[PDB]
Amino acid sequence: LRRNEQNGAAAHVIAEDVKLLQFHVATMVDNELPGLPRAMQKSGRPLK
């Protein structure tokens, strides 16, 4: 996101990346929100 905001984006890549970073941080805090992608890493096991 730093690189995109430095080199200039297409006004929607920035928004999608912001949403993705928000999802990653939220799932790091709690990985049980209702109606979420439910991030996994490997073998299909959800994180902790």
Considering the complex, state which of residue 15 and residue 26 has its C-beta at the smaller distance from DNA: 26
- Write the DSSP assignment of 11-44 as a string of letters: SSHHHHHHHHHHHHHHHHH-S--SS----B-STT
Q: According to CB under 7 A, which one of 34, 37, 41, 48 is a site residue for DNA?
A: 34
Q: Which amino acid is at 29?
A: V
Residues 3-32 touching DNA, rule: CB under 7 A, are 32
Q: Is 42 in the site for DNA (CB under 7 A)?
A: yes
SS3 of residue 27 by DSSP? helix
Which residues here bind DNA, judged by CB under 7 A? Answer: 32, 34, 42-43
